[PDB]
Amino acid sequence: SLALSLTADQMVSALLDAEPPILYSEYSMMGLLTNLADRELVHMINWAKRVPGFVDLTRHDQVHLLECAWLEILMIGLVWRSMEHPGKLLFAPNLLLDRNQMVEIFDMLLATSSRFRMMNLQGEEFVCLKSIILLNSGVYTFSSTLKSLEEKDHIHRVLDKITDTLIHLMAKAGLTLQQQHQRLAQLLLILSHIRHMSNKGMEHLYSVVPSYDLLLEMLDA
Amino acid sequence: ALSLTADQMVSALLDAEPPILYSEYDPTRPFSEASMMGLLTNLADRELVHMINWAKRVPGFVDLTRHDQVHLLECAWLEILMIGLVWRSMEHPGKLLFAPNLLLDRNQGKCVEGMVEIFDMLLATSSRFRMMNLQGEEFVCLKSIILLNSGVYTFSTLKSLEEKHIHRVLDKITDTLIHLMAKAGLTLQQQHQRLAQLLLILSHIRHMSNKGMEHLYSMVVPSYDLLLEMLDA
Ligand SMILES: C=CCn1nc(-c2ccc(O)cc2O)c2cccc(C(F)(F)F)c21
Ligand SMILES: C=CCn1nc(-c2ccc(O)cc2O)c2cccc(C(F)(F)F)c21
Ligand SMILES: C=CCn1nc(-c2ccc(O)cc2O)c2cccc(C(F)(F)F)c21
Ligand SMILES: C=CCn1nc(-c2ccc(O)cc2O)c2cccc(C(F)(F)F)c21
Numbered sequence A: 001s002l003a004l005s006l007t008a009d010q011m012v013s014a015l016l017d018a019e020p021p022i023l024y025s026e027y028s029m030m031g032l033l034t035n036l037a038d039r040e041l042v043h044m045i046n047w048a049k050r051v052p053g054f055v056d057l058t059r060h061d062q063v064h065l066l067e068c069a070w071l072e073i074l075m076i077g078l079v080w081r082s083m084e085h086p087g088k089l090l091f092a093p094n095l096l097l098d099r100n101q102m103v104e105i106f107d108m109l110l111a112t113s114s115r116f117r118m119m120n121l122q123g124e125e126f127v128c129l130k131s132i133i134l135l136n137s138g139v140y141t142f143s144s145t146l147k148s149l150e151e152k153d154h155i156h157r158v159l160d161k162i163t164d165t166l167i168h169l170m171a172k173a174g175l176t177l178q179q180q181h182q183r184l185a186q187l188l189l190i191l192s193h194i195r196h197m198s199n200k201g202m203e204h205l206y207s208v209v210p211s212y213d214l215l216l217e218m219l220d221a
Numbered sequence B: 001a002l003s004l005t006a007d008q009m010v011s012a013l014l015d016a017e018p019p020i021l022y023s024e025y026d027p028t029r030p031f032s033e034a035s036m037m038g039l040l041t042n043l044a045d046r047e048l049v050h051m052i053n054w055a056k057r058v059p060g061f062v063d064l065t066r067h068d069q070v071h072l073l074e075c076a077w078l079e080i081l082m083i084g085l086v087w088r089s090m091e092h093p094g095k096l097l098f099a100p101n102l103l104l105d106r107n108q109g110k111c112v113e114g115m116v117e118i119f120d121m122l123l124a125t126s127s128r129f130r131m132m133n134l135q136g137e138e139f140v141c142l143k144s145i146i147l148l149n150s151g152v153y154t155f156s157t158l159k160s161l162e163e164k165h166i167h168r169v170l171d172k173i174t175d176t177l178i179h180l181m182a183k184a185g186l187t188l189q190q191q192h193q194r195l196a197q198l199l200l201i202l203s204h205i206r207h208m209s210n211k212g213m214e215h216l217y218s219m220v221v222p223s224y225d226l227l228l229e230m231l232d233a
Helices: A008-018 A029-048 A059-084 A103-119 A123-136 A146-172 A177-206 A212-220 B006-016 B033-056 B066-091 B115-132 B136-149 B158-163 B166-183 B188-216 B224-231
Strands: A088-092 A095-098 B095-099 B102-105
Touching: A008 A123, A008 A146, A029 A059, A029 A088, A029 A212, A059 A088, A059 A103, A059 A123, A059 A177, A059 A212, A088 A103, A103 A177, A123 A146, A123 A177, A123 B188, A146 A177, A146 B188, A177 B136, A177 B166, A177 B188, B006 B136, B006 B166, B033 B066, B033 B095, B033 B224, B066 B095, B066 B115, B066 B136, B066 B188, B066 B224, B095 B115, B115 B188, B136 B166, B136 B188, B166 B188
Parallel strands: none
Antiparallel strands: A088 A095, B095 B102
């Protein structure tokens, strides 16, 4: 109940400090990417616990948010890394792959990376977007208790704080009020496409995923 | 359409609104799995024709090439149906108003296997809109955004980047949404917060759409050709 008292700058600083490291691929291709994703997942948990307001929530709810968001988070991280490598996805510094190397998903990832490039997405805006995804992707599916409804409001209030943060970053960058609301919209609409990609990828898997207990156990430590 | 005032944008959108259709009459009740699917499938099909008329009247849409218009529709058609359903169902807590003569609750959708999830998700969204007091002029803006956004990234060449115009119009709709919020007397802070809240919901509407498609291929979606033919008129 005090991430609600943070300012835009403190919010950013906290998020920038919580950033996971860029991990390397250990050296088929599914093995390297699965292993990479697995090691990344462990850092994602500690990153989450450092997102302002996340630990204010019950364990059950923390797990659910991650359960619904973990894939979208890996994906937006990938897209951010690959921003300055047109036509290539930088899974790891030692694992840069082009188109020809689930092509649908690969193409959508490139498309999103190009979009971030065009917009000149800033690192400070990136960490904000990643936070939004965490708090948003599972908020509409929590369920009758006063506590549950107590969580929802809290999450919504934190998301408001992040919106305030994003706007502030744009004002500081010298954007007009009109340019501010426009860029906010452009950024948030991209999240819909990231959601879409996560869903597509998720059905390819069905065609051992982080289950509910796998995460709940990992959060304990 | 980049010359319209926010007021003129709202008016044009409101005028484009499709009519509410009825589920075909005197179906055998209670329902069977295949009876339900038939009624809803038939409804969606008849609604698709009107959605296209609506799209043609969305400012900026006609400026695109036929091919691009079909692509946006192929991607967004289901999301557009769903946001319409959620809007209709707003003042019916715990129920979904697929049609004025077809008001179903949680347990009347248990007919189909797995579609209960989607039912719950649709109900949750409707509650959210209700809680936010989503206004009509905001709804039409959100729907237009879905149309122009859902397929904008999954379209190179010079002519192609000029079409990606779409982002200008989306900016225009954002301006309109904000203007609507300023009129109502919201503070700047409140304005950007509400704008964010609305757009984040689109992410969830996308999700519900994807779950739908998932079960569709799990049990004859509007084809490219079909959508093109109906566009030509
Ligand atoms: C282009 C998506 C493939 N991909 N990406 C990833 C992936 C891994 C880590 C990461 O940070 C981002 C990713 O997209 C991945 C992980 C396991 C398996 C797969 C594959 F689809 F190939 F089976 C993974
Ligand atoms: C479900 C999609 C494939 N996949 N699997 C995984 C995956 C990674 C680790 C793990 O322990 C289990 C997984 O299914 C994955 C991770 C990131 C990105 C992707 C994707 F391919 F979708 F882009 C991943
Ligand atoms: C959530 C109910 C399922 N549903 N909804 C719809 C649907 C139809 C029209 C509309 O405006 C909104 C809808 O959710 C639908 C259409 C065809 C088939 C189905 C079914 F799942 F049963 F197979 C449909
Ligand atoms: C039955 C699969 C899902 N579906 N299919 C359809 C659908 C509608 C018309 C048509 O010609 C074919 C369809 O699969 C549909 C329409 C509205 C809502 C839904 C959904 F269930 F996802 F909510 C629809």
